């Protein structure tokens, strides 16, 4: 697995010894090459896993997330090129260093055969994101956002650590393989109930759960474009990956303990979808839509059936790509208008038609139009939920309707109607922005041709 980790580490000396006007070109080229290298982990087995060494292993749950993580860095560099143009060379190199460090931590987090090593890297990711938000954010609220984004996480993550070490004192190991093979039933006890809660809440706060989702709109609205991209695409999926990994030792207590979280998710998806209907901020709207999709993923993981896990994997990948694209489109609007308010710049289809096409495709894929992988994950989760209880179909159908409603509302408000008269600084879209949108969207429509690559280890 070092054939991916070492080039990512070499990205740092290459960045810092680059010329003042060659940092973006070199970083983008070598990040794309690293993505191409990482693309060969998709050759998975129907047997156990790709156990490279005692420290790192690969899975068909890990490999799609790793490929997405590698693919996200070049796009983040392209998106950050514009608003960081007036910046000093040292600070641009520091920004690129933060991005590379975040990729390295994510890559090691997703393989991480140990639960303590997974926890350490899972929390190491928290530092570069915090620096990116609180340093290169525009508004005065960024600091506050960072505080929220920090403490929420730690509020859930310190109990997990305690539980983790406790488990190793009783089991003797925290290796995923030994943990899976030597799993024993968890008795219905108060001690076991609190161990279950300690194991779950850390990943639950990062999805985020509906009750604990307040940090996310703050962090996304306050962060720069690359920060928003990585938060929506990869960092939200750490909770899903961790829950899928750790729920193996929580049976049969999950049957009883899942009820409050299932109710919170099934009602909060309706709640956040309706919130999206009355939102004056594009970034806030996209953040709330992300909360709804991750609520569906939480339901999938808690149900804990093969179709649930397949749908959860597919939905995580699809949402990562779609939400990153949506944030990029909103940022292209913001870099022209400097307002970030949806109602201000109107009728942009008449002034920017190709970007209107990109908006339409992104809205269609957020809307879960078949046969997109968004709908593949949605439908698999919905079928699993129907088998769990036939009454869930009501809430799922309401969520689908409201999702279509706010997606097309966001499209119509910004692209249709009459242009705002007093806005005259709207320039033709750049080749960089069009290429960014294309590099987001073509992978989705290619993945719909080979869905088994993103359906996980239970396929």
């Amino acid at each position: 697995m070092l054939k991916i980790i070492i080039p990512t580490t070499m990205l740092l000396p290459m960045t810092w010894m680059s010329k003042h006007n060659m940092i973006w070109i070199n970083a983008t080229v070598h990040s794309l090459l690293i993505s191409l290298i990482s693309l060969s982990l998709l050759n998975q087995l129907g047997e156990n896993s790709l156990n490279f060494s005692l420290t790192f292993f690969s899975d068909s749950l890990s490999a799609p997330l790793l490929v997405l993580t590698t693919w996200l860095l070049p796009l983040m560099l392209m998106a950050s090129q514009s608003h960081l143009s007036k910046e000093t060379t040292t600070r641009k190199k520091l920004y690129i260093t933060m991005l590379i460090l975040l990729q390295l931590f994510l890559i090691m987090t997703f393989t991480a055969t140990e639960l303590i090593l997974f926890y350490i890297l899972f929390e190491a990711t928290l530092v570069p994101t915090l620096i990116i938000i609180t340093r290169w954010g525009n508004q005065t609220e960024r600091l506050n956002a960072g505080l929220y984004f920090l403490f929420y996480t730690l509020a859930g993550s310190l109990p997990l650590l305690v539980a983790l070490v406790y488990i190793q004192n009783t089991t003797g190991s925290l290796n995923f393989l030994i943990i899976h093979y030597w799993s024993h039933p968890l008795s219905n006890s108060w001690s076991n109930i609190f161990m279950w809660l300690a194991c779950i809440m850390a990943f639950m706060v990062k999805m985020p759960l509906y009750g604990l989702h307040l940090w996310l709109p703050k962090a996304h609205v306050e962060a720069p474009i690359a920060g928003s991209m990585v938060l929506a695409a990869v960092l939200l999926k750490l909770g899903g990956y961790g829950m899928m990994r750790i729920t193996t030792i929580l049976n049969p207590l999950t049957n009883y303990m899942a009820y409050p979280f299932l109710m919170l998710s099934m009602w909060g998806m309706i709640m956040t979808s309706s919130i999206c209907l009355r939102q004056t901020d594009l970034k806030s709207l996209i953040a709330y839509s992300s909360v709804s999709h991750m609520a569906l993923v939480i339901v999938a993981i808690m149900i804990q059936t093969p179709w649930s896990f397949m749908g959860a994997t597919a939905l995580m990948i699809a949402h990562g790509l779609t939400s990153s694209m949506l944030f990029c489109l909103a940022n292209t609007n913001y870099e022209r208008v400097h307002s970030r308010t949806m109602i201000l710049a109107r009728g942009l289809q008449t002034l920017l038609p190709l970007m209107a096409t990109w908006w339409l495709v992104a809205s269609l894929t957020n809307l879960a139009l078949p046969p997109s992988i968004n709908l593949i994950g949605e439908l698999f989760i919905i079928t699993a939920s129907f088998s769990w209880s036939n009454i869930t179909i009501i809430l799922m159908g309401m969520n689908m309707m409201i999702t279509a409603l706010y997606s097309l509302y966001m499209l119509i408000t910004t692209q249709r109607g009459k242009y705002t008269h007093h806005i005259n600084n709207i320039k033709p879209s750049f080749t960089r922005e069009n290429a960014l949108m294309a590099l987001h969207i073509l992978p989705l429509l290619l993945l719909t041709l080979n869905p088994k690559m993103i359906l996980g280890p239970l396929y």
Binding site: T55, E114, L174
Partner: protein, 57 residues
């Protein structure tokens, strides 16, 4: 016929011919507890190293 002892003669340490048996346990001591096993052997490398969390060495 008594000759007075000289200086430092009555402070000499002298020997005594006695038939009284030497007390074998004048302190009435109990039996001393057995010592610890004081294990001895040849050192070998630690099995799989430190075995601390994820460290392989």
């Amino acid at each position: 016929g008594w000759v007075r002892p000289d200086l430092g003669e009555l402070s000499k340490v002298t020997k005594v011919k006695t038939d009284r048996p030497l007390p074998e346990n004048p302190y009435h001591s109990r039996a001393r507890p057995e010592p610890n096993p004081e294990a001895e052997g040849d050192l070998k490398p630690a099995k799989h190293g430190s075995r601390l969390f994820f460290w392989t060495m």
